[PDB]
Design a binder for these strands. Structure first.
Length: 402
RNA sequence: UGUAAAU
């Protein structure tokens, strides 16, 4: 901080004016100081004259090096977002020029600004507040090589990608979807704490749900094409995504969403079917199996139930079947529990048994009787476990009301 | 008895 701005104690004087700081040439010193930046942040919220704006624009977003220094500063990045705000609100000669100079500045340092904890906020800010056409150009400056992977898995830059997906039309970031759907990129990105969220956010935006009813038919066709490209790669690696600690949320999201029903059905038929006993014993994939049971259309649900009740050869030495294994397994027990809940919801009217006017109630009753007969015969061993007690108590409650 | 984001 420059000595002319301090008092008898080395403290910043009160009663300082904005134009004093602007005229002094020491704005950069105030902007990286906590107290000075607080003053500037508050001062620029007032009624500024045209010349005060002129000085602000030139000293904060006028020169690349000072812009970058402020954008990557723990305090300056806030002043940068404020000045960009004022710039967007000031409809003078320079309105588009300032945006383009700003777009060019960020474009030239795009990777490093995304990876920076503070500059990545300046980027997200510009993406959603700048004129859409300039914001779209900013998206094009994203790298196309291994840096884009590093961006998706970064603790800070992953939010830049999610911001792009939220506020930019799909045409401008289609290359990200094709990048992500590249098989080797997909595995790295989905299997990461941050990148998993990136892929889920992409899929959500690519879904024709109620939040996309405002799209044109032409935008829906483009959306559907990107969705199919991404879904093809995902379903091709579905088993390894379903069993990964971070990617399993992606399979769950596809399976649980009615507006992705055809992709749900393809995952169930091509990935989980004939693997239910194995995947039910997996820490992460057992969550995927539950969602499949909960959301499967009735014909696939019947096939999944029949795979558990009668798809596996009993153990040759003891005669234990798949149900025996799963009911006592550390993860499989939640799947049986889910199966029991579905059947009880059906008989008790809390679940639709008609699918297209055709009633499958008889089938739910069949599955419930199988679960009840097993639980009744194994009640003593099952009473030793919480999951077992839960099943026993769910059953007794049910037929004392029906 | 069972898992996830940065001023």
């Amino acid at each position: 901080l420059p000595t002319w701005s301090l008092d008898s104690n080395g403290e910043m004087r009160s009663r300082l004016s904005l134009s004093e700081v602007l005229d002094s040439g020491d704005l950069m010193k105030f902007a990286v100081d906590k107290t000075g930046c607080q003053f500037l942040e508050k001062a620029v919220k007032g009624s500024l004259t045209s010349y005060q704006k002129f000085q602000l624009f030139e000293q904060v977003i006028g020169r690349k090096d000072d812009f970058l220094k402020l954008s990557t500063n723990i305090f300056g990045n806030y002043l940068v977002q404020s000045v960009i705000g004022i710039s967007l609100a000031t409809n003078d000669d320079g309105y588009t020029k300032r945006q383009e100079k700003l777009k060019n500045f960020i474009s030239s340092q795009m990777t490093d600004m995304c990876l920076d904890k503070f500059a990545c906020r300046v980027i997200q800010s510009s993406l959603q507040n700048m004129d859409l056409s300039l914001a779209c150009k900013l998206v094009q400056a994203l790298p196309r090589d291994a840096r884009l992977i590093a961006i998706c898995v970064d603790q800070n830059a992953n939010h830049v990608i999610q911001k792009v997906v939220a506020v930019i039309p799909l045409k401008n970031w289609e290359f990200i979807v094709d990048f992500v759907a590249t098989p080797e990129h997909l595995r790295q990105i989905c299997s990461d704490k941050y990148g998993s969220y990136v892929v889920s956010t992409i899929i959500e935006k690519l879904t024709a749900d109620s939040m996309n009813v405002d799209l044109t038919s032409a935008a829906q066709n483009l959306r559907e094409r990107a969705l199919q490209r991404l879904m093809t790669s995902v379903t091709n690696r579905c088993q390894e995504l379903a069993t990964n600690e971070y990617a399993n949320y992606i399979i769950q999201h596809i399976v649980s969403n009615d507006d992705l029903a055809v992709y749900r059905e393809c995952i169930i038929e091509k990935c989980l079917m004939r693997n239910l006993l194995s995947l039910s014993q997996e820490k992460f994939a057992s969550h995927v199996v539950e969602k499949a049971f909960l959301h499967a259309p009735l014909e696939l649900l019947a096939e999944m139930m029949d795979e558990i009740f009668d798809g596996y050869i009993p153990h040759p030495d003891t005669g234990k079947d798949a149900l025996d294994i799963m009911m006592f397994h550390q993860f499989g027990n939640y799947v049986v529990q889910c199966m029991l809940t579905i059947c009880c919801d059906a008989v008790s009217g809390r679940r639709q048994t008609k699918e297209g006017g055709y009633d499958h109630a008889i089938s739910f009753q069949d599955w419930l009787k199988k679960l009840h007969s097993r639980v009744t015969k194994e009640r003593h061993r099952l009473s030793r476990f919480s999951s077992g007690k839960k099943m026993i108590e769910t059953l007794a409650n049910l037929r004392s009301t029906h």
